[PDB]
Design a protein around this ligand. Structure first.
Ligand SMILES: O=c1[nH]cnc2c([C@@H]3N[C@H](CO)[C@@H](O)[C@H]3O)c[nH]c12
Ligand SMILES: O=c1[nH]cnc2c([C@@H]3N[C@H](CO)[C@@H](O)[C@H]3O)c[nH]c12
Ligand SMILES: O=c1[nH]cnc2c([C@@H]3N[C@H](CO)[C@@H](O)[C@H]3O)c[nH]c12
Lengths: 267, 269, 268
């Protein structure tokens, strides 16, 4: 089965066991899994039961949310754990076949812009791929998109205006800047963070960019919000630590959920 | 590797056994630029799917014959790293052309103009390059019959030959630019942020090719001239999506001037 | 079917059962500096092609006494440009940790991007940039060595770096300090890529060191990096780069380099 058939086999499996035509995809990262656990009349598809899914826990949650039919990944597949870029982004392809037209991606990142504070929410206006790989390398899947997809509106400008307008109505302070993905799993060095600032990055992370590339190629609109869980490694004298990342993510979590619940109602 | 070396020589011996020519000039043409191969005289034709160990495509051909007093072999169609080939698969035809006798390589490509003073249709003499792809064609065991383990890259695009191209274009009235070409892996078009980073790194043009061939060319002992056609302004400069149909149309509108430059270059080389 | 975790265990098991030593300092020498390992006394030799699961060549481990310390030296390292994976390149560091190594001393030869330097200078590495395109920690995390997301704010120990500078001052050895950028290789950089490297904040460009430093820090080891500027980085001068001259410049200051290395190992 070519990668093309393997994607379709996973989609026909879910479609044959689903009452839903989900229109919004959710890749929740910054501890926003609580959003998935509030989906109504949910169907659950764990990854190990879906054919051709990446192996080794997480699950797909499909159901109702603020009048929208959604599908959400609980756990994410990461490039630093050893998965290929094709395995990392396969759930996005299956999402397209389930009917997804708008993808909402959230993550946790380190603030490179010295004007940010941990806890801030940065709408992703653009990204820099600094990992050394590309998920579209290989034979093009013509049933999904063109060989040379455009990336001038990777994070839909009109959707970004909607988030800003929604955040203003709710009184939620929001930032907007360029996200940069490193492969990981090492935290960046102080010199690499200064390099990221020079290249134009406002935040650094280890995800998001692969699925945003595939979602655009598959004909989806993409909206991305990154939660600054820490200052990037070079800016403060304290060492970076993942227990600190989850903690800061948990502090501003409720505001993040409120912002993300309102956009899905209004998309 | 020995397997690669065997398969490279097996491809060249196949071509040599069926060819009348001993070419010294090589050409690598990137799609909307392959029409100059149609002007090679009494040409021989070798489709890639008939040459042993040539990478299978997802139908490009070698064109060998006379051109402006020289004997040339032109790659009508090149293999790209974004299609899934390894770096060694992408560049192994350059090794084949070397065993064919090629001493000077003319690399052409289509690229997006990062320099805001450039215009779609301009021709850029590649003076240097930035490898931003995340791979190197020489990683692995060295092919000792072709070059050294640590090849120098200080004159990758021959300075004397760039000066000869600048004088030929001046003699013909052809405006030519000269700048640095950056290669991304592809097949995505760069984001506006990646284009601004490309300018910060010192790049005047962005493309998805050239760099791997130039590395293997210089490693093999060949001189290289790079002429990149500005088929579009790089992403984010204008308020337009980037489209492969635009790349093809601009390549087609500048073909006449591009043929006249290269035709004279090959004669005076 | 033996996982990476047990392959490293078997390598350490093989060396341990054949060694009376528990070295605390690891030496990845490469700026020539093979004489350092020659001066290891009462030494035990472990050829690479005899340690189980070590990467295949086309080198040896030296363990013994040095300046009051018990050390294990890597005589000849594995490079990413030769085709080894990032895990094959750094596997000896995992083995060195199981042998009890607490501090890693990495030397190399690099091209000087900073125009202040002159060929022959010695630069303490204060930080690095990974421009190779890979990372030796990508894959399943080895829980017995370190954490999933290791911090890299002190990749080259600051207190140790100051001790080198004190030792270099009492010895009268000139010393620079700057950032090391690792390209993949094996090509020498282009003049544009060198200009890019400086814009990125790099003072030297090389083809190694970065993978070992990442794995050493992940395993809980302190790292000292010393780079010898064997040449001006490409484009800085109007002459080509080649390996014969890198080795000539490494040879011209081996004595001075070796005074520094013998003294720091003594005072660590
Ligand atoms: O400063 C950072 N650099 C890189 N990644 C992260 C993250 C994200 N959280 C996780 C590791 O803290 C991981 O998913 C990573 O993408 C938070 N802060 C940073
Ligand atoms: O702006 C650009 N960015 C990247 N590649 C290209 C190209 C080249 N042409 C093809 C894409 O249209 C592809 O082979 C690439 O190398 C033209 N313009 C651009
Ligand atoms: O200017 C340079 N660029 C990249 N590597 C090196 C080296 C080192 N010596 C070897 C290549 O000459 C290799 O180990 C590389 O790490 C010396 N100078 C340079």
């Amino acid at each position: 089965m070519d990668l093309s058939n393997k994607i379709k086999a996973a989609a026909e499996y879910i479609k044959g066991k689903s009452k839903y035509n989900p229109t919004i995809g959710l890749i929740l990262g910054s501890g926003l899994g609580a959003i998935a656990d509030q989906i109504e009349d949910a169907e659950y598809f764990p990854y190990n039961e879906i054919p051709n899914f990446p192996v080794s826990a997480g699950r797909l949650v499909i159901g109702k949310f603020q009048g929208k039919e959604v599908v959400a990944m609980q756990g994410r597949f990461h490039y630093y754990e050893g998965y290929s870029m094709q395995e990392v982004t396969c759930p996005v392809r299956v999402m397209r076949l389930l009917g997804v037209e708008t993808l909402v991606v959230t993550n946790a990142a380190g603030a490179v812009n010295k004007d940010y504070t941990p806890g801030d929410l940065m709408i992703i206006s653009d990204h820099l791929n600094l990992s050394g790989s590309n998920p579209l390398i290989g034979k093009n899947l013509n049933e999904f998109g063109t060989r040379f997809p455009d990336m001038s509106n990777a994070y839909d400008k009109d959707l970004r205006a909607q988030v800003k307008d929604i955040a203003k109505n709710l009184g939620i302070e929001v930032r907007e800047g360029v996200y940069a993905m490193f492969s990981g799993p090492t935290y960046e060095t102080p010199a690499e963070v200064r390099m990221a600032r020079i290249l134009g990055a406002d935040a650094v992370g280890m995800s998001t960019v692969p699925e945003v590339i595939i979602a655009n190629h598959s004909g989806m609109k993409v909206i991305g919000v990154s939660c600054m869980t820490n200052m990037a490694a070079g800016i403060l004298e304290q060492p970076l630590n993942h227990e600190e990342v989850m903690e800061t993510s948990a502090k501003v979590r409720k505001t993040f959920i409120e912002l993300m619940t309102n956009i899905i109602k209004e998309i």
